[PDB]
Amino acid sequence: TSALSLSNVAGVFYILVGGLGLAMLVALIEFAY
C-alpha cells in the first residue's frame, strides 16, 4: 500500500485554516460589540 496519502490531508488543512480565518472574522465582530 505504497501511498502515504499526504497531499489530500494538506488540502483539508487548507480548508481548516480557512475555517480559522472565518472564526477570527466572527471573533472581531464579537470583540467589537
Binding site: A23, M24, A27, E30, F31
Partner: peptide, 4 residues
C-alpha cells in the same frame, strides 16, 4: 484569541 476569542475569549481574551
Amino acid at each position: 484569541l476569542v475569549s481574551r
